[PDB]
Write a protein that binds this ligand. Sequence first.
Ligand code: 7UO
Length: 164
Amino acid sequence: GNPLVYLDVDANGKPLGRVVLELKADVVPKTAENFRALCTGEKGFGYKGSTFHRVIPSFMCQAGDFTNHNGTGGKSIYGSRFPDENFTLKHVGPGVLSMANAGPNTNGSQFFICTIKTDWLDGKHVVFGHVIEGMDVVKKIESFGSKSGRTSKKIVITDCGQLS
Ligand SMILES: CCN1Cc2cc(CNC(=O)c3cnc4[n+](c3C)NC(=O)C4)ccc2NCCC1=O
């Protein structure tokens, strides 16, 4: 079955709760496996302790830069970047989990959770999962963003891992 993973998120040092994500390994196994392993930390690096550094209300919440914490960094379990696996899953609505990138074939570790349908990203960002539980937490994160993406609270993934 497809992995279930979790992110436990704080804002300004107080817990918001847990976001549970299904990773669609049946569609995008390489992309799912990268995210899964970055949640468990089993390769010796990953999302634990990193931040949602770019959050835009009515768009998305972006995280995963565990090296530079600002959108310039992150790395995959395979190397610094890996190819776009496919574009089969679409940005259909709130709760979609998708890879951030800097152009074609530049997936690393940065990712975003959509808070609206973002159809213009179809064919450009690899969708690889969705929120199973914790959209309330996502809406809290979203509420601490701004048009510029700068967050108004420090949003930290304090813990993360694999549920199944
Ligand atoms: C740098 C190369 N590089 C890291 C890398 C960079 C981006 C691109 N960065 C962004 O898209 C991004 C991030 N954060 C913010 N913005 C943007 C546009 N705008 C904001 O206001 C905040 C996306 C993925 C990776 N990982 C793959 C590994 C890799 O080769």
